[PDB]
Ligand binder design. Structure first.
Ligand SMILES: CC(=O)N[C@H]1[C@@H](O[C@H](C)[C@H](N)C(=O)O)O[C@H](CO)[C@H](O)[C@@H]1O[C@@H]1O[C@H](CO)[C@H](O)[C@H](O)[C@H]1O
Length: 135
């Protein structure tokens, strides 16, 4: 998949990003990439088949190098099924919920949240909407 949600002003606490769509049939991967220039502040990557195991891989890329992965086995996504991803920005971490249920937390590694200018949305999904607001 290919699509970029511009975040004018960058990421900031109290910001809530909502992603609505439907996972494609025979899906293999999904990915949300919060970017800061060439760096990837927060990579959210559900993998549907890694050695016959489903897993959500989260990481950060700094100076073209991926860091220590943070893996989550709770996997709420289903091929062909609609989904909702919510990312709430906190001063210390990104809080992710899927289908209204808390899923995981990713501590900030990239500290200048204001430089996080956009969110790339890709993978095997049919995007309905990608938006944000404060709460
Ligand atoms: C293709 C692939 O999924 N590679 C993953 C694998 O990389 C090892 C070192 C090797 N290149 C291989 O698999 O043949 O394992 C590493 C973790 O040890 C990683 O999952 C590789 O996938 C990459 O993961 C990062 C996030 O950590 C990004 O999602 C990259 O897009 C992805 O290729």
């Amino acid at each position: 998949m290919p699509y970029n949600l511009p975040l004018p002003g960058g990421v900031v606490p109290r910001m809530l990003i909502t992603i609505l769509g439907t996972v494609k049939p025979n899906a293999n991967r999904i990915a949300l990439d919060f970017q800061r220039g060439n760096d990837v502040a927060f990579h959210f990557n559900p993998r549907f088949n890694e050695n016959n195991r489903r897993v959500i891989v989260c990481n950060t890329k700094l100076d073209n190098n991926w860091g220590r992965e943070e893996r989550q086995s709770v996997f709420p996504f289903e091929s062909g099924k609609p989904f909702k991803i919510q990312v709430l920005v906190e001063p210390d971490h990104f809080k992710v919920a899927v289908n209204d249920a808390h899923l995981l937390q990713y501590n900030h590694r990239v500290k200048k949240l204001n430089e996080i200018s956009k969110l790339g949305i890709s993978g095997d999904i049919d995007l309905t909407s990608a938006s944000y607001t404060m709460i």
